[PDB]
Amino acid sequence: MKQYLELMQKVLDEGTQKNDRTGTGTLSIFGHQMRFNLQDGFPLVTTKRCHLRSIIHELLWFLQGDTNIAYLHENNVTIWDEWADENGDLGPVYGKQWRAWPTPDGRHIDQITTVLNQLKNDPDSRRIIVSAWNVGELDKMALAPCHAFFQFYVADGKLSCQLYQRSCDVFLGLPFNIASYALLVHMMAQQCDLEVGDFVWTGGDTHLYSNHMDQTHLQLSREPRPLPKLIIKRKPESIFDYRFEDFEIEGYDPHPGIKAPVA
Amino acid sequence: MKQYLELMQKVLDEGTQKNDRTGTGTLSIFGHQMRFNLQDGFPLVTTKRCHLRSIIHELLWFLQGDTNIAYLHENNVTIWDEWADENGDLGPVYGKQWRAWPTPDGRHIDQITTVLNQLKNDPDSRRIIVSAWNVGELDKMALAPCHAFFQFYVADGKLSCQLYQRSCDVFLGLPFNIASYALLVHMMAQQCDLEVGDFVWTGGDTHLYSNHMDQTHLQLSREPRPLPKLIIKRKPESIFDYRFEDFEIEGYDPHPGIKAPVA
Ligand SMILES: C#CCN(Cc1ccc2[nH]c(N)nc(=O)c2c1)c1ccc(C(=O)N[C@@H](CCC(=O)O)C(=O)O)cc1
Ligand SMILES: C#CCN(Cc1ccc2[nH]c(N)nc(=O)c2c1)c1ccc(C(=O)N[C@@H](CCC(=O)O)C(=O)O)cc1
Ligand SMILES: O=C1CCN([C@H]2C[C@H](O)[C@@H](COP(=O)(O)O)O2)C(=O)N1
């Protein structure tokens, strides 16, 4: 899409050389914001064929609160295979903090139910927030939360959401992250009987990897196709009762899928 | 400043009439970003006089891990009076989280020290985060964090920082928040022997209170003056050894102040 391609070109223009946690090399900028009005369509990248398959399972996996990748193995999702121990555990990563943030005094906070209740009872609150950044349990996680903080906002009957992502692999991860949270907004809006508003994406270290130039340029050479439309074919009675087959997409006619060496 | 007046202009031209926790009423937008190059000048509003005094004492009060306003009283700083109890306590707010985030098992985490070592030993790190949003203790705070979590970034020997502000009182709060965090960058950069880069301000619910509109129209009718220069007379032993006598602002010739009620 336009905002995505424009970000890639900005990294090429303003990016600085910055070695990463392994020495692969990136072109990096710090501080970026994008806005996706979900009324115009679902923000699924079209300059390369993407798939919601692993995005849906991981989101549902997040919402269940289980940080064991068992569910992903049963459904043939592999994005977490190289980070888990033998048990298949990742620590108190996203799912755990979303549903059971542990307190000092031995309690647990279900942030998802709090947000949903806030959106229903007090949609004007400026405190409708979910944070995966549990400073006290970062050392127990196989990976520090990347998309670690998002907030909801209601106005004119439209539900908006802003995400803060401390680190962004532009070519590989960003199309995945955008689609993931746009899905969450649609799911949250449906359970709150609201319309969808804007998805705001905010990034910290936003970077292209040195070995993604050929794939970047190939994608830049292509014109964005019309955005597709999300089709929820079934309305669950709970935000935690969604099923993989509930989600379809129409009018998604992308360019040939682009493949790079993964993470 | 240009960026500040532009945002104030943006709220008036696109804000939504929202009611708020205080029953005052606000014009509100959601999702905004600003950048301040700190080598250009210190970002202290000029279209209305702002008193750096209270700002400095507040930041030095944060970096001590203290949440009692007793220190703020010693220097006639009253910005946190309407929210403290008789003993001047606000609860586990910004300071408590910065210096001693309480874990579930019982330990405490010093985020200021943590970041200072990350910046010195691993400046390429993309997870240099301080967070004040402690979901496990929000119910104990007299007011949820507004400047809720920020990220540091190092490139080309320059130190940058991005803040996420879930809620922003554009007229009263934002000028303090900007100056406050820009001051922290100058201090972090000094202790890490780095130059100052950008302060990136990101906002969630960004709004103007209904009883501030007349003051806003007055301020918008003024032109920003050249930014002043911050001077730090000394190099303290650490980030926590700063004194109010170490800072001095040079070239700050603002328009006359504009008084307005606090909500
Ligand atoms: C963001 C995020 C979640 N994540 C997590 C994740 C973890 C570490 C990372 N590390 C790096 N360097 N970049 C990444 O973006 C990255 C992403 C993902 C990781 C891999 C794929 C992936 O397999 N991409 C392939 C798969 C193609 C397909 O079959 O659909 C691709 O070519 O697109 C997707 C998401
Ligand atoms: C952000 C932040 C810190 N804070 C904390 C704080 C707490 C609750 C709030 N509540 C609301 N609705 N708006 C605020 O911005 C706000 C700010 C401040 C609070 C007041 C002033 C203030 O009274 N400013 C006057 C000067 C008064 C004085 O100190 O002499 C001004 O000139 O505008 C400044 C900062
Ligand atoms: O540092 C700060 C402290 C808080 N505020 C203002 C913004 C809000 O208008 C107010 C707190 O309102 P709430 O959203 O919590 O209900 O204080 C601010 O702008 N900066």
Ligand SMILES: O=c1ccn([C@H]2C[C@H](O)[C@@H](COP(=O)(O)O)O2)c(=O)[nH]1
């Ligand atoms: O949701 C995610 C998770 C990870 N990454 C990418 C960004 C980084 O390049 C890499 C993680 O490396 P660190 O930022 O943690 O060092 O994975 C994403 O883009 N999105």
